[PDB]
Design a protein around this ligand. Structure first.
Ligand SMILES: COC(=O)N[C@H](C(=O)NCCCC[C@@H](CO)N(CC(C)C)S(=O)(=O)c1ccc(N)cc1)C(c1ccccc1)c1ccccc1
Lengths: 99, 99
């Protein structure tokens, strides 16, 4: 699809069999999702935001569907204002910016 | 142009007589730039996200040139870790997400 930016580019994602709303975010290196249960082990990660740095849990090789496109990659879990799909997964779904 | 998301989508902007590097950020509602002087009236604003909130100065009706395209809009100025071009200006240059 082609998504304009007059409103927030919110899409439906599927993860752990559950639908969530998430923001397609070209300014984010990494995908960060609100607190949830994910399988396997996690490792520590620091991410830097507008307000400063936060600790998040890093889960690798997670199955996630974004606007119907399947991806498998790193998902960070922590206190984010909204679920965000960052470049690590935007690249997997073949997303580009165009003007 | 078509801009890849393999790397941070950094572009050159011209604002207030200055050349700056800025991130094309579909996740950001607003354009936020590191400390700089701008003409005209401003009011204080809080913008938030990962890490929490920062206080910024809001300048309206500011002329910017983004990657060759002229636009007018609101520019927030404050202690952001990176220059961000938000949706308020991305729309004006006709920027879309495609996949
Ligand atoms: C007055 O209205 C608002 O405050 N709106 C917010 C806004 O537009 N602010 C711009 C945020 C700043 C942009 C942002 C990417 O888009 N960051 C990355 C930049 C520092 C490069 S970062 O948040 O620091 C972040 C860091 C790491 C990673 N991995 C991801 C993101 C909005 C929001 C959007 C996207 C991300 C965070 C917040 C928001 C929505 C809901 C509730 C509160 C706030």
């Amino acid at each position: 699809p082609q998504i304009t930016l007059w409103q927030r580019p919110l899409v439906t994602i599927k993860i752990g069999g559950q639908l969530k709303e998430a923001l397609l975010d070209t300014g984010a290196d990494d995908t960060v999702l609100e607190e949830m249960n994910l399988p396997g082990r996690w490792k520590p990660k620091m991410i830097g935001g507008i307000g400063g740095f936060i600790k998040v849990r890093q889960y690798d090789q997670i199955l996630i569907e974004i606007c119907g496109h399947k991806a498998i990659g790193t998902v960070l879990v922590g206190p984010t204002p909204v679920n965000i799909i960052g470049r690590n997964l935007l690249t997997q779904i073949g997303c580009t910016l165009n003007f």
